[PDB]
Paper text:
Overall, the individual domains and architecture of SpGH38 are similar to both dGMII and bLAM, albeit different in spatial arrangement and intra-domain contacts, overlapping full length secondary structures with mean square deviations of 2.6 and 2.8 Å, respectively. Secondary structure matching of full length SpGH38 using SSM not surprisingly reveals the GH38 Drosophila α−mannosidase II as the top “hit” (Z score 9.8 with 664 residues aligning, r.m.s.d 2.6 Å). However, the structural divergence was significant enough to prevent either being used as a suitable molecular replacement model for SpGH38, even when shorter, more conserved, features were used. The α/β-domain features a distorted β-barrel core composed of primarily parallel strands, surrounded by eight helices of varying length and an appreciable amount of coil. As discussed, SpGH38 appears to exist as an elongated dimer. The SpGH38 dimer forms through an inter-digitation of the β−3 domain into the opening formed between α/β and β−2 domains of an adjacent molecule. A series of van der Waals' and hydrogen bonding interactions stabilize this intra-molecular connection involving hydrophobic residues Y574, V629, W764, Y766, F767 from the α/β and β−2 domains with F429, F433, P434, Y438, F474, Y476, L478, P479, F483, P486, and F488 of the β−3 domain which would be surface exposed in a monomeric state. This insertion of the β−3 domain effectively reduces the area of the putative Man5GlcNAc binding site in an adjacent molecule and introduces Y476, F483, R484, and Q431 which could putatively stabilize GlcNAc and Man substituents thereby anchoring a high mannose substrate. One possible reason for this may be the insertion of the β−1 domain into the active centre of the dimer mate in the crystal forms observed here. In particular, Arg484 from this loop stacks with W764 discussed above, thus reducing accessibility to the +1 subsite in-crystal.
Streptococcus pyogenes M1 GAS SF370 ORF Spy1604 encodes a putative GH38 α-mannosidase. We have shown that The S. pyogenes ORF spy1604 encodes an α−1,3 mannosidase that is active on disaccharides, some aryl glycosides and can also effectively deglycosylate human N-glycans in vitro. This, coupled to the presence of a gene encoding an N-acetyl glucosaminidase (Spy1600) on the operon (an enzyme known to break β−linked N-acetylglucosaminides) would suggest a role, in vivo, in the utilization of human glycan-derived carbohydrates as a nutrient source. Comparison of SpGH38 with Drosophila Golgi α−mannosidase II suggests a conserved domain architecture and catalytic centre in which diversification in the “leaving group” subsites accounts for the subtly different specificity.
Author numbering:
A (entry chain B): 3 to 513, 522 to 901
B (entry chain A): -9 to 514, 521 to 901
């Protein structure tokens, strides 16, 4: 005797094959229909709103007058909401974003008065390894998902060579930290109970199939029927359907249910023989063609923009505002929430994955700009608040003080690129022309040289003055009208080391190079970098002695696929930039920094052939496509700026070009020839270990694209390579040579999936600039290479202030006790009480480590990810893959 | 004390009304969010001062209710506090939603601003009885009528009137001079309102000192400045400025002022109180200003009229969304209500609020930074999508209720709608779905093959029939194809299919606000263009394409001949987003002097499409000096920059479309702009003998001189604003040029040439600093649409509504064979008049009455008003849709705007 739980739902992709507003208007219809059916049908139990609270906001933005009816429907349990804000892509949103989704989701649920105790990942294109820890520490003990695993027959014997097979639709999901949750697999998809018939003959055919399908995998008598699908209207006659089903099947108890009741029933009946699945679930034991992993390189410009806003909020704005609270006794919670919600409107999977129509991705760019602007405003305000409260009296009156901040979790060594204001010539009531000329005359008369001093008056000899100029600028005072002026600007380079979460005040006053042109060699204490005749690099590690030849190869291939899936044409042969025309240009060359440009011009097919258009129009599966690249070629010019800094082991690259070719992919390759069968990728709160070969038992796709956050690394036990990136979230390991391949551009012409949706802007025509890095590592520098790749995305922050008394010291470290193996991801304050919150995680899944983090004259208390206090004592060590959130209060 | 037993004369006092405010441009020299965060600071400071200073009376929130929404979007928890501040009168709000540019927003948009503003004010429970135009770059001539019929009797404005003292003889030739800062503003319909001029700007009372020495200097100047122009003892001191923070110590400043000046009563005041005091003390008669205020009597350099051609792509987008909402979505939904008993009020409000977020003057004027205008494009898309969804739904609701049983089962019915206020004759360009091959559980490829085989085996021809089964022989089948498509049912899952699509043109005439049902089925002479002659000819016009690509057009009715029409002129522009400046000694480049080629696109008896293509070399940019002049904030009039020596080829392609029974010749000019700091115009030399011209303006065809005022004007150019058209008419014959979002024109008076601006490319914002705006160069592809019609006395007014309604295509939708309550052919209104424009056809929120709005296309003559909706009775309402007690007129007064509510009989 089975219990058949019918859960009515709609999987509501916020924006996808139509612009947001087209989906939005149909969402109004859905909720209108729900509110009406709650009135006309007393037996309609509930409706699951797809796990995302944003739906409620979207509805009320159009029908604000319906707020009381919405609140009532939630209060009665007829609308089952959240527990998330949006339904993300796990891998393409930042580690912090994965938590903020839950923080905002919970805030919304608390406001409405109800939640659903189920992490909801119905459609997610691969599931992060840390889902179990992320759920447990967000007050959730279960997650439901539809992708990444294929249920083996609940029928078959043990064997168990298949790591990602499951007997049942219920699993014990274990993460790298040993956290365990219930994994509820939609084994028959989230549409298995869609459109239940209300007439006998049709109902019989439907239920005989559906019951058998669910029983094939159920570990209990509780069968889950998901009554909904993508943008599915509510089934208005579902009560009639359920009543019929009960009449037709005396041995089955059909009930209109909800996820909370379903989990309750499961809890009572779950057996002890659930399959365990360990870590990330990314379709490892499939044919590899439909992982949709190539969303990582769809519209890379979106991922770059996301990275910029994420770093702004997490690593600049929040840390500065957290510290500024000392001065102001306030922290901008409302403005930050507004910025975070704006950013996360770009985090629904179809949005960030770049797998929607053109209109959707144009709208996303605007959202990125808005969230950035808010974060940028708040960061500048916080930095000023601190600087204006620093005791800057040690600097002479004929100097211009400025404060430099490292807002990251470890020591930051860099050559900071600065533009400081030396003098302001205000417009007043004069003609701007007169004021401009006065500034010109000051510079014409200037005979002294600009210098950088510390509080002791000591000159920093390593600073390099690059030039002076006049530039219009303005100030916006808090208590008076705008103030326009011409500024005398001083452009300079400043080598500096700043400890974690620290500031240093300096001031501007009046008072053998790295590159060898005869050798075409960039050299510092760490690396010797030989630019080859073909533009590729030979890099020698000066500590280990290891030599890497033919690094930095640019590779252009055909792509006849879509926004989800890359497909190289049959017989595709790459075009290599190094086989074209090579030119070298020195941009700068001092003892502190060298910048070299390597330029290649090579001919590539301008497009795909005409067959592609026919194959897309006919909705031909990507694996069957016969289209090739065009015969006609055009010259593509790549320019890569290589930046070496004196005391920096990390070599920085920026590759720029104007893309005027369609249906192709550009990658940069780093062949390592390292002896190892695995690699390490920056994933959501974990450095996840992955095989270099996909599983040859199941895998058919000639490629194995994988997701990364800030870096990917190969390491043989003593030596290795770490490649960092900025918003370049797709990599591949080429196992024959252990080459790291980073995707810089992927251009396609259609969305893909269920139909033909032309997306010409997915071709990514126009200018691009991609940044990435190389570091050669040893056992001793491995973990530092990982936080450098993460924290290297965040520049030294500067702000100017005058000479004044102050309550703050001119240099200060807000925290101490850094560990190479311990990443810092959050430094913020708590909404409830303004307590300082930190979040750290173990960069290893294999080893515990010391946890030394300390904020001077604060005590730490352990919280969960939602920043609610736990009973756990503060550890002195981190477990494998542990994510530790701490609230800090004055001693 | 001693004055009581030895009394002297009772002395008069002045009353100094200090109104604290902030003029809050929503977005401008920074992105919206940068201004938005500072707005949070302003309101935060305000709420704090209300709690700490009992003497702080009120703050004027810049006449725009959007500010409240913007604040609460960030601090939704402050709603109770905001409500209490409004209820107590400490925050003075609206009466508008936003502060628009008048001329660059649609006629209806100018009303919707007031409708939404009033709605917001009603929700909050307070308003301010003052139309608010503090900074508007030109004030529309209908402001007095628009205010009165939205229940407002006063408007405040800052630009375009020169107040003279009470010490000098008024000069009667100065139409835009005033004696005082208070005027009677009289509109073309004879409506009068109180005009409140910011004679000393809206910043005259900014940052009032709180220390005696400085306060003396301040007030000695400010009092004299205000008294100079005040008609009463009541002096207006505006305590604020652009993005000005609240003056937290204004109470102290007012207290000090009261101590220092015994003869002056300083009070922390508000506009409502100021207007009440004026009602008591205003003289019975004030200087009259008649009509539009556009800075006619100035040097013409700082009118900011060239905002009309800044980022023309914005104006085109705005026109598209405005037509979508006003003339497609609203009319369809209004009619669909008869079938469904529901109308999408909430969704329409959302669409309108979204669109009007692009209507603040700095937004729509194109005079902000690059980030702002990128954000605006997203808002236009959003508003359009909402309107487009609702129109499609409404058309389907109507079609599904039509009795389509007269059509045979082997045919595909479709309904054609004219959603405009007059008869619509056009050649509809259609793509109909003949058959659908659903995916089901098959591989799409197999379904695709089945559709292909169907088309391959097709032996019959497609035809269009009516309800009597009669074939329409004028219809032209252009082709058939297979296209992926999908349906989104109300009650089930998406339905993908391959559709057999039939592409065709259908000449059709549809009465005003009407539909007609036809069907597609299968069944069994002299072209308009003569290539030997290079001549397009119908019954109205003979159009000879000259060897140089300009046109010679002969009006076949009147015999008049116009040579050398359609000249494309490229000039330099070394100005900014506000002001166009041609360099010293600039010589135009003409496309007709380049390489000319001609291409026949289509040519039948019903339609001919010709492309004239010119390639001509123009300077790629301004010279190197312009950058230095921008960087040093050199005034545009003093700039010495010229165009670059280096040139590149610019290719223009203009598609000319002539239709058989259409007097209006349609033009679409396209090109890829890759040159900076230039202006492209199209010229129509008329040589018509007339000293005035007529432009489509806000609910009026405004009359303007062809020469600017030489007593004052120094600018060599005289750019003017237009909505849908501009016209020259000599009393018997004329020319009407229509446009689609090309809102800047100029009349060149020596030849009476109508010049339409197609592109203006500049590299900085302008105004108070150097704000580089590379995207204001408008690089990339452009497509501009406009029209020519030759008119007589008998066709003048029809040429005007054709230019307006010709922006709106015939609407179509398909439906199957079914019973229905609606007739297959129906006219929803009758009693059209060439002289009466229809601008609104919508429903009212309160009771779903059908609202119509019409206006008189003449400022000079009355006309009959015949509008009738069968099955309905009308009563007169104001612009805000509030019933009046006025009887329905049978005539329209000069420039009258008439709003009616219709209810079933
Ligand atoms: Zn989805
Ligand atoms: Zn303004």
């Amino acid at each position: 005797t089975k219990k058949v739980h019918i859960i009515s739902h709609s999987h509501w992709d916020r924006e996808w094959y139509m612009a947001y507003e087209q989906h939005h208007m149909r969402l109004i219809n859905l909720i209108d229909d729900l509110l009406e059916v709650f009135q006309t049908d007393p037996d309609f139990h509930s409706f699951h709103l797809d796990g995302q609270t944003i739906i409620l906001d979207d509805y009320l933005k159009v029908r604000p007058e319906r707020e009381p009816e919405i609140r009532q429907a939630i209060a009665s349990g007829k609308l089952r909401i959240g527990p998330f804000y949006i339904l993300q892509d796990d891998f393409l949103t930042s580690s912090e974003s994965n938590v903020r989704n839950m923080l905002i989701g919970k805030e919304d649920c608390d406001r409405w008065g109800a939640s659903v105790p189920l992490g909801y990942f119905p459609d997610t294109f691969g599931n992060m390894g840390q889902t179990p820890q992320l759920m447990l520490k967000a007050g959730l003990q279960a997650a439901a998902f539809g992708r990444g695993i294929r249920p083996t027959g609940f029928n078959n014997q043990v064997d168990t060579s298949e790591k990602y097979s499951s007997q049942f639709s219920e699993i014990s999901w274990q993460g790298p930290d040993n956290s365990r949750i219930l994994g509820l697999l939609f084994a028959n998809w989230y549409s298995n109970g869609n459109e239940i018939p209300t007439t006998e003959a049709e109902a019989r055919l439907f239920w005989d199939k559906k019951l058998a399908d669910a029983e094939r995998f159920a570990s209990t008598k509780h069968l889950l029927m998901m009554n909904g699908c993508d943008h599915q209207p509510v089934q208005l006659d579902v009560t009639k359907a359920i009543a019929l089903a009960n009449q037709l099947y005396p041995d089955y108890e059909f009930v209109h249910s909800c996820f909370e009741d379903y989990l309750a029933d499961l809890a009572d009946d779950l057996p002890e023989n659930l399959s365990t699945v360990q870590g990330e679930i990314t379709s490892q034991e499939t044919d590899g063609w439909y992982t949709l992993a190539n969303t990582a390189s769809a519209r890379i410009y979106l991922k770059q923009a996301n990275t910029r806003v994420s770093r702004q909020l997490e690593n600049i704005t929040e840390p500065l505002a957290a510290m500024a609270y000392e001065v102001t006794s306030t922290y901008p919670h409302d403005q930050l929430r507004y910025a975070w919600k704006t950013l996360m409107q770009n985090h629904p999977h179809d949005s960030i994955c770049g797998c929607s129509v053109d209109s959707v991705h144009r709208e996303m760019m605007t959202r990125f700009e808005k969230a950035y602007e808010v974060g940028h405003y708040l960061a500048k305000e916080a930095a000023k608040q601190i600087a204006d409260a620093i005791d800057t009296r040690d600097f002479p009156m004929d100097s211009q003080p400025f404060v430099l901040f490292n807002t990251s979790g470890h020591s930051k060594t860099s050559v900071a690129e600065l533009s400081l204001t030396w003098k302001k010539y205000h417009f007043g009531q004069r003609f701007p022309k007169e004021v401009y000329q006065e500034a010109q005359e000051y510079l014409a008369r200037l005979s002294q040289s600009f210098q950088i001093i510390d509080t002791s008056g000591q000159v920093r000899p390593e600073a390099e003055i690059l030039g002076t100029s006049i530039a219009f600028d303005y100030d916006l005072p808090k208590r008076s009208f705008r103030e326009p002026y011409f500024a005398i600007k001083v452009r300079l380079r400043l080598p500096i080391t700043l400890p974690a979460m620290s500031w240093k005040t300096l001031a501007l006053k009046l008072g053998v190079s790295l590159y060898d042109d005869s050798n075409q060699c960039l050299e510092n204490g760490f690396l010797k970098v030989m630019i080859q005749t073909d533009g590729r690099l030979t890099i020698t590690d000066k500590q280990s002695g290891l030599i890497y030849q033919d690094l930095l190869r640019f590779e252009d291939c055909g792509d006849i696929g879509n926004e989800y899936i890359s497909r190289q044409p049959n017989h595709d042969q790459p075009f290599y930039a190094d086989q074209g025309t090579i030119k070298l240009n020195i941009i700068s060359n001092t003892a502190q920094v060298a910048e070299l440009e390597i330029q290649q011009t090579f001919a590539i097919p301008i497009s795909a052939d005409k067959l592609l258009q026919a194959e897309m129009e006919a909705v031909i599966d990507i694996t069957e496509r016969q289209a090739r690249r065009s015969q006609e070629k055009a010259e593509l010019t790549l320019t890569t700026l290589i930046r070496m800094e004196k005391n920096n082991p990390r070599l920085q690259f920026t590759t720029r070009f104007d893309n005027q070719m369609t249906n192709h992919r550009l990658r940069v390759l780093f062949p390592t020839h390292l002896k190892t069968d695995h690699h390490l990728a920056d994933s959501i709160f974990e450095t996840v270990k992955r095989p270099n070969h996909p599983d040859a038992t199941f895998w058919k796709n000639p490629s194995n694209p994988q997701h990364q956050e800030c870096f990917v690394s190969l390491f043989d036990g003593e030596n290795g390579v770490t490649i960092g990136n900025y918003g370049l979230n797709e990599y591949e390991i080429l196992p024959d040579t252990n080459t790291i391949a980073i995707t810089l551009l992927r251009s396609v012409g259609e969305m893909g999936d269920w139909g033909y949706f032309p997306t010409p802007e997915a071709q990514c025509l126009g200018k691009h600039s991609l940044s990435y890095s190389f570091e050669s590592i040893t056992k001793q520098t491995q973990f530092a290479s990982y936080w450098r790749a993460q924290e290297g995305q965040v520049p030294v922050i500067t702000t100017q202030t005058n000479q004044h008394e102050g309550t703050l010291a001119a240099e200060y470290s807000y925290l101490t006790g850094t560990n190479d193996q311990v990443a810092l991801t959050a430094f913020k304050r708590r909404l409830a009480d303004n307590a300082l919150i930190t979040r750290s995680y173990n960069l290893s899944n294999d080893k515990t480590c010391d946890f030394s983090l300390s904020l001077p004259n604060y005590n730490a208390k352990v919280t969960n990810l939602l920043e609610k206090d736990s009973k756990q004592s503060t550890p002195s060590q981190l477990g494998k893959a542990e994510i530790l959130t701490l609230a800090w209060k004055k001693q």
